[PDB]
Design a protein around this ligand. Structure first.
Ligand code: BEF
Ligand SMILES: [Mg+2]
Length: 1076
């Protein structure tokens, strides 16, 4: 065999592998053998390697191969090499591509994806609790390896060539060489140092930020592993499949590796990997799950899910110790194979400046014509042969300025610093300019909009005087004073505060996460719990009949200090309670209130009490459970909820103000996602909802029909044959799609169902990571640009597909986003949007200015190549150093405004609104230069330029006039082409830029009006007339006025005028279509 095609199911790649030996016996044209090119051939074949491979390697079978080459379906090429190890076949020939680790098979002569995955013959029969008896940490750790070591930025060269190395290098290097050959001492060095400093600074900054963020993601833990029948502590990075450890140990807080409980139980919280906001319980494996276990499965059935622990899931509680341990666990998948890991690896597999590429190619095309005409004129004047190339090739390096990327990078860093000054850290500087075109902002529910746990909302009390519920009573302070365990209020306070199996450790209890929050809601101090000292008596606890799967309630026998008798306090599930309680106490509104509080997403809990007169140390053990819950008295409801973060609503309001659509994408259920949306503002307060349900046939059938119904009032609907419009509070509505209906729609849709759904859909629930990324792709296909404020691994993949990615937890693997935040809130988005818009407008301003610079320079030179006399060699330097770089750099020294606006900056460079003002600025600048030149042509003397010689003489009156006019144009155009009040702070407010402009203009005025004689010789000036010296000032002033008035009024009007003359986004059509 000599080739192979894989099939990668986790991410569709279908890679192609082919093996090649190293150089031939004769390799005289190898990359370094082409030393005549040196680095040129290296550059040529670094990106496109087909010639590289055809030059070097020939086909060899995989048995004797020396390096393999990998080809995915993007037609993107890569080259890897095999490794070698001499023990268990006699050699593990293998390769590694994007963290997939492919093993050779000496028997069938093909590659395999880790031989699939292992199900050991010794493991999983009945009892794999023996442990790794002997040497099974060396003979088996070689195959599997350590736990999730990512990369150390393989070499600096890839980072340099990807993040920083712009395509402008070739012409820039040629320009530096030409200037070196043309006696440019100062400016070549200035350009080289500025570019090198900026690039090295960027590379070092990004490397250090990446290191700082990656070091925190290690999360290394310690575990008490069985080895050979002994108990030994070990680091978390020393585990292989078939190795037992223990869970009940207090020092453990996160599951090390994906596992399978064998003895005991536990309660865990899988929030981040799935999205559910409810803690889950686990149970052992009964020798039937072990046989029905294939670790290769992408997602398990319900049983094996019920017995697994997922790596990274937070451990809440375990069966406590009796010196021993009661929660052992087996290890099945370690490394990248873990479910949390597989998202990280599959994230990295898939690999505006093109406008600058267009400008570069157009400028090169124009430089061709300029070169042609310059050579024609030079050969017409038959000047010295050497001087028919150098000064006839400076045209190219002055029509394609090389100082552009440096100033763009500096302007970007002036915003990256402001971002890092607000606790927001950026790991990819390019995305800042993408922040100014966000037209949709997607969120997540658990962890970003709302806190990650359940919080008690209030207490409802079933009075005994009138069988009617009472108000919400959100605070215990009002609870204590309320009156009518004979009093139901106290019988509710006791059950909230006492009656729980909590084990306090450090003044804050640890245990089941439901009654804990209840305990802190009570606020008392904790086998007796005395009330807060700031009148409630002291409660005593005797014995607890705790939770049972069959009977959903728990009970406690308590004794008040003051009273002689005792009480039985029970807390349970309202579904089963009424058959226990005394029927003449239920307030007849039980069903309605329960249904109301359940159909909104909340969760409820019922309390009941029973007085018992005779209680002693004997009857406590004598009486069984049934007598405790024989007949009791209902008290009321304890209502949970999913609390919002305190500041989310204001941020959502401000985003809705500035005409930015918002949607919510979650993984929880829909019944609470709708209510969470309705509280904050994503859905309007009175807007209806509409859900699509299969009228007949599940997602299996391709012919199934879908009915779009309401939620609050069934039997009502909007159109299905498809209009997504109200059939037959009606102008506003929103569609909330489940997680399987969306899959069926994307599988089958008339392309109008999908589009109207995507325009109207607001609250998606039960969505999976692949569903999330397909949704983001469809969102971008209808011509959006959607940011994503995700926080967990469950939505890591989407964070890569979005245009702008934010994150809320740098600790976990959500570092995929180009951004990262250290203040966990939604208060992070408006700042990013503001900075993005300001950076966009500043980048366009600087780009237009630096592209007008070239035309100024070219016109000034071309008025002079008629007589073959350049500007000089020091006026060039003054213009290119003291005039451009200060103005161009300091024009980006500002910050964004404080408040958002409904407006939006332009985003397309080649549009008919960024280019027309530029060309008209050119057509006023050339007008004023040629005007001054004509003004000096006739009225003043000395106007003859010296006839052509071997050395192009440069002391004329056609040099000095077109040097001052050019200088004034540089300064004033730099002032005018600015970004002011609409998206930045007022220029008058910030001093650096305006003071730089003032000092430079004073310098020029001093050099013109009364020039020092030593400087009058240092440059090649010539004497002028007082009147003409005033005239130059007048020309500068009128350029200022004309440029300002045109830039604010004229050229935008002419833009629309020419657009209308030329008259002779897939969405924003559907909105009008469905306006009703
Ligand atoms: F925690 Be979220 F659902 F990504
Ligand atoms: Mg999550």
């Amino acid at each position: 065999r000599s080739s192979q095609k894989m099939r990668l199911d986790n991410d569709d790649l279908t890679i192609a592998i082919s093996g090649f030996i190293t150089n031939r016996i004769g390799f005289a044209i190898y990359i370094v053998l082409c030393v005549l090119t040196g680095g040129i051939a290296w550059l040529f074949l670094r990106w496109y390697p087909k010639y590289y491979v055809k030059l070097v390697g020939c086909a060899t079978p995989f048995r004797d191969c020396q390096w393999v080459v990998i080809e995915d379906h993007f037609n993107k090429m890569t080259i890897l090499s095999i490794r070698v190890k001499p023990y268990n076949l006699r050699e593990l020939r293998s390769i590694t591509y994007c963290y997939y680790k492919f093993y050779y098979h000496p028997v069938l002569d093909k590659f395999f994806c880790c031989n699939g995955w292992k199900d050991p013959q010794w493991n999983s029969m009945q009892n794999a609790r023996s442990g790794l008896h002997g040497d099974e940490k060396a003979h088996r750790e070689a195959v599997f390896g350590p736990n999730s070591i990512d990369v150390d930025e393989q070499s600096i060269l890839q980072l340099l060539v990807s993040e920083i190395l712009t395509p402008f290098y070739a012409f820039q290097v040629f320009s530096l060489i030409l200037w070196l050959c043309d006696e440019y001492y100062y400016y070549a060095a200035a350009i080289l140092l500025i570019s090198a400093g900026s690039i090295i600074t960027s590379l070092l900054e990004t490397k250090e930020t990446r290191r700082r963020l990656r070091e925190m993601s290690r999360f290394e833990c310690e575990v008490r592993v069985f080895r050979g029948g002994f108990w030994r502590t070990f680091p978390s990075s020393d585990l292989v499949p078939g190795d037992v450890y223990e869970v009940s140990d207090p020092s453990l807080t996160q599951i090390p590796a994906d596992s399978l409980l064998l003895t005991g139980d536990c309660i865990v919280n899988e929030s981040m990997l799935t999205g559910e906001s409810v803690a889950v319980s686990k149970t052992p494996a009964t020798n039937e799950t072990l046989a029905k276990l294939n670790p290769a499965a992408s997602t398990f059935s319900h049983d094996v899910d019920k017995h697994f622990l997922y790596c990274g899931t937070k451990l809440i509680r375990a069966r406590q110790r009796l010196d021993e341990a009661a929660a052992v666990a087996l290890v099945v998948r370690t490394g990248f194979n873990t479910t949390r890991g597989a998202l990280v690896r599959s994230m990295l597999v898939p690999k505006f400046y093109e406008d600058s590429f267009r400008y570069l190619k157009v400028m090169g095309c124009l430089a061709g014509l300029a070169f042609i005409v310059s050579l024609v004129n030079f050969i017409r004047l038959k000047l010295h042969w050497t001087l028919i190339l150098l000064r006839a090739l400076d045209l190219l390096t002055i029509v394609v300025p090389p100082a552009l990327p440096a100033t763009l990078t500096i302007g970007t860093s002036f915003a990256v610093q402001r971002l890092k000054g607000k606790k927001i850290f950026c790991t990819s500087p390019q995305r800042v300019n993408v922040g100014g075109k966000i037209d949709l902002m997607c969120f997540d529910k658990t962890g970003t909009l709302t806190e990650e746990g359940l919080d008690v909302l209030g207490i409802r009390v079933a009075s005994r005087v009138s069988n009617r519920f009472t108000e919400l009573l959100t605070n215990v302070d009002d609870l204590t004073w309320s009156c009518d365990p004979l009093d139901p209020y106290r019988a509710a306070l006791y059950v909230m505060a006492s009656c729980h199996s909590l084990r306090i450790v450090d003044g804050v209890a640890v245990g089941d996460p439901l009654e804990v929050k209840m305990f802190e809601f009570t606020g008392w101090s904790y086998f007796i719990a005395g009330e807060v000292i700031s009148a409630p008596p002291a409660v005593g606890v005797l014995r607890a009949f705790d939770f049972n799967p069959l009977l959903r309630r728990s009970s406690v026998i308590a004794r008040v200090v003051g009273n002689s008798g005792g009480y039985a306090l029970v807390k349970g599930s309202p579904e089963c309670m009424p058959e226990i309680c005394r029927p003449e106490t239920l307030p007849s509104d039980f069903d309605e209130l329960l249904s109301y509080y359940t159909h909104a997403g909340y969760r409820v809990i019922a309390c009941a009490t029973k007085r018992i007169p005779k209680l002693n140390l004997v009857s406590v053990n004598r009486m069984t459970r049934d007598e405790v819950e024989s007949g009791l008295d209902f008290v009321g409801f304890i209502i949970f909820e999913n609390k919002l973060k305190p500041t989310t609503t204001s941020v959502i309001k401000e985003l809705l103000s500035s005409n930015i659509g918002t949607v919510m994408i979650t993984g929880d259920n829909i019944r609470t996602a709708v209510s969470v949306a309705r509280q904050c503002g994503i859905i309007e307060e009175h807007a209806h909802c509409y859900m699509p349900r299969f009228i007949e046939g599940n997602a299996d059938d391709c012919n199934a029909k879908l009915r779009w119904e309401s939620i609050n009032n069934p039997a009502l609907e909007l159109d299905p044959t498809d209009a997504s419009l109200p059939y037959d509070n009606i102008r506003n509505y929103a569609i909330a799609v489940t997680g399987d209906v969306f899959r069926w729609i994307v599988d089958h849709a008339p392309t109008d169902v999908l589009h109207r759904m995507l325009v109207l859909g607001k609250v998606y629930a039960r969505m999976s990571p692949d569903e999330k990324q397909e949704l983001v792709k469809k969102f971008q296909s209808i011509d959006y640009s959607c940011g994503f404020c995700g926080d967990g691994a469950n939505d890591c993949a989407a964070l890569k597909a979005a245009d702008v990615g934010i994150s809320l937890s740098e600790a976990e693997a959500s570092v995929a986003a180009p951004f990262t935040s250290q203040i966990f809130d939604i208060r992070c988005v408006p700042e990013v949007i503001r900075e993005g818009r300001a950076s966009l407008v500043t980048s366009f301003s600087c780009f237009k200015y630096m592209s007008l610079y070239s035309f100024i320079q070219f016109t000034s030179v071309s008025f002079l190549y008629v007589s073959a006399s350049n500007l000089g060699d020091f006026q060039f330097l003054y213009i290119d150093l003291m005039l451009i770089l200060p103005i161009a750099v300091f024009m980006s020294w500002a910050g964004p405004h404080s408040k958002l606006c409904a407006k939006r900056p332009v985003s397309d460079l080649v549009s008919r609104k960024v280019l027309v003002p530029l060309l008209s600025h050119v057509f006023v600048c050339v007008m004023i230069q040629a005007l001054a030149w004509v003004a000096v042509r006739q009225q003043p003397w000395y106007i003859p330029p010296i006839v052509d010689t071997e050395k192009s003489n440069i002391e004329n009156s056609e040099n000095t006039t077109l040097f001052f006019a050019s200088c004034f144009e540089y300064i004033l155009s730099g002032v005018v082409l600015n970004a002011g009040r609409p998206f930045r702070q007022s220029p008058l407010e910030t001093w650096p830029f305006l003071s730089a402009v003032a000092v430079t203009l004073i310098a020029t005025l001093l050099m013109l009006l009364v020039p020092p004689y030593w400087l009058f010789e240092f440059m090649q000036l010539t004497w002028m007339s007082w009147t003409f010296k005033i005239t130059l000032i007048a020309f500068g002033f009128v350029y200022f006025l004309i440029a300002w008035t045109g830039e604010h009024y004229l050229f935008l009007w002419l833009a629309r005028f020419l657009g209308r003359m030329r008259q002779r986004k897939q969405r924003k059509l559907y909105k009008i279509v469905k306006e009703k």
